[PDB]
Amino acid sequence: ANLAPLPPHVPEHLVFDFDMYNPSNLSAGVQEAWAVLQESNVPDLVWTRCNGGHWIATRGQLIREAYEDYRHFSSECPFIPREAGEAYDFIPTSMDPPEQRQFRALANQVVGMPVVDKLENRIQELACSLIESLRPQGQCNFTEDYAEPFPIRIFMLLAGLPEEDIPHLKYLTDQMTRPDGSMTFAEAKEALYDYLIPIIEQRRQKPGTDAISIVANGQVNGRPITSDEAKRMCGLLLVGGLDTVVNFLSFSMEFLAKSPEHRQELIERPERIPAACEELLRRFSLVADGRILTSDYEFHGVQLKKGDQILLPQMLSGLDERENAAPMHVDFSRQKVSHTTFGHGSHLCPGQHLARREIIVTLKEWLTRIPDFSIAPGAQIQHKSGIVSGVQALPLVWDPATTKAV
Numbered sequence: 483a484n485l486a487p488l489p490p491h492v493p494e495h496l497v498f499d500f501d502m503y504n505p506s507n508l509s510a511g512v513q514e515a516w517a518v519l520q521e522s523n524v525p526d527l528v529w530t531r532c533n534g535g536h537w538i539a540t541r542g543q544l545i546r547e548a549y550e551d552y553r554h555f556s557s558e559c560p561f562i563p564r565e566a567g568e569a570y571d572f573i574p575t576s577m578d579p580p581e582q583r584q585f586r587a588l589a590n591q592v593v594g595m596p597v598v599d600k601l602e603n604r605i606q607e608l609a610c611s612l613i614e615s616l617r618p619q620g621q622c623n624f625t626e627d628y629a630e631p632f633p634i635r636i637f638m639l640l641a642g643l644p645e646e647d648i649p650h651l652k653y654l655t656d657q658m659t660r661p662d663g664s665m666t667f668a669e670a671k672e673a674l675y676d677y678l679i680p681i682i683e684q685r686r687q688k689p690g691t692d693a694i695s696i697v698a699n700g701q702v703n704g705r706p707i708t709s710d711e712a713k714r715m716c717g718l719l720l721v722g723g724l725d726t727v728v729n730f731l732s733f734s735m736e737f738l739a740k741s742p743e744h745r746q747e748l749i750e751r752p753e754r755i756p757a758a759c760e761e762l763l764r765r766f767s768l769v770a771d772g773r774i775l776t777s778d779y780e781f782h783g784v785q786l787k788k789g790d791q792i793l794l795p796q797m798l799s800g801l802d803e804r805e806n807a808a809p810m811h812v813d814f815s816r817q818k819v820s821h822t823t824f825g826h827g828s829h830l831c832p833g834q835h836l837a838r839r840e841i842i843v844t845l846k847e848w849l850t851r852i853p854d855f856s857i858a859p860g861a862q863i864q865h866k867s868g869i870v871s872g873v874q875a876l877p878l879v880w881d882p883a884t885t886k887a888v
């Protein structure tokens with residue numbers, strides 16, 4: 483295919499041409515497609531000539547180690563291909579400690595556990611209303627009818643943005659994680675910034691109680707945050723709010739629809755939902771970004787060159803059979819659910835608490851109202867791969883007679 487010429491410093495035996503935006507075994511499921519990187523024929527650290535050429539760490543050990551060592555593995559250029567990585571200037575993700583710290587503190591403020599706790603009632607409220615509205619229909623297009631509106635509307639409420647702007651923003655955020663080829667990466671990013679700029683200016687002058695007002699008027703390093711810094715942070719918040727939980731919920735529901743035994747498990751033993759959420763986060767992990775080498779560095783017997791990009795798939799740690807036995811099997815009773823679904827190191831996800839709350843609320847409220855459901859007959863669910871992977875469509879069906887109006 484479109485393979486870049488092999489750099490002189492890369493041993494031929496370490497080459498494995500994996501395409502993160504279109505993996506070969508995608509039809510088997512996106513996580514399954516990525517897991518081919520963990521078969522016996524693939525070394526721990528390999529070089530793919532796809533997408534401009536870059537390294538890929540395939541084991542949890544290397545992924546965790548790399549995410550911790552920011553001195554060698556910089557977040558300055560975190561996305562593949564390099565073009566995207568270089569245009570990517572979100573805050574604080576494109577920064578390494580110490581610089582990142584002050585901005586991350588501010589981000590924790592607007593999406594951290596305290597915010598989640600205060601927002602739980604709205605989360606509960608929306609989940610219940612959306613699910614009840616669908617219950618009597620006996621069918622739904624999950625991605626469009628719940629997966630997107632639920633987490634996204636909660637985020638828009640948090641950020642104090644009009645739901646009317648969702649379609650526009652959602653299209654843009656997805657061009658940065660799973661480009662469909664209709665927009666260049668930098669242009670999609672700028673479009674996001676063009677939208678935010680006037681809003682940030684407005685909320686710095688006349689601050690509201692929303693997350694954007696909080697960010698735009700925050701302080702970093704003992705001084706006021708700049709309009710541009712606030713912009714670069716809010717841009718990141720939009721992506722996290724619009725293209726993370728949204729995708730994960732579909733992977734989870736697709737699975738539950740296909741496994742009555744697991745649904746039954748959660749209906750008969752509700753207290754197991756939190757554990758189930760965690761196991762699902764491992765099995766259907768969906769993120770994969772990376773870092774750039776700050777200098778020549780030998781890593782686990784492999785010579786890495788300054789400038790080289792290395793993909794450190796957050797998705798792979800939990801699927802690594804070295805971290806979890808029978809990794810592709812969902813066991814809600816797994817004693818130790820090991821994963822790096824929310825990242826690792828200084829950039830570990832601050833919105834993970836909001837994510838878990840939304841997932842757990844979704845599982846409890848959906849199963850209590852629509853306990854029995856399955857994939858629409860004749861439907862063949864397909865996935866999409868990228869920085870954040872997802873489910874293209876998920877047609878679900880159930881018998882309204884077996885549902886319960888709460």
Ligand code: HEM
Pocket residue numbers: 557560573574575576582586589593637718719720721722723724726727730768769771772796823824825826828829830831832833834836837
């Ligand atoms: C299932 C849901 C989610 C997953 C799997 C996820 C995953 C991740 C991962 C892997 C990282 C680290 C990436 C890196 O090291 O380069 C991260 C960072 C981040 N996430 Fe999440 N995330 C989720 C939901 C959210 C939500 C809902 C928000 C908030 C709107 C959010 C906001 C952020 C921010 C601000 C960062 C950057 C933190 C920093 O750079 O210090 N995330 N997330």
Ligand SMILES: CC1(C)[C@@H]2CC[C@@]1(C)C(=O)C2
Pocket residue numbers: 572575659718721722726769770771869870
């Ligand atoms: C890799 C991510 C999941 C993380 C939050 C949104 C995302 C796409 C980023 O750009 C940082």
Ligand SMILES: [K+]
Pocket residue numbers: 558559560567568569570571576
């Ligand atoms: K950059």
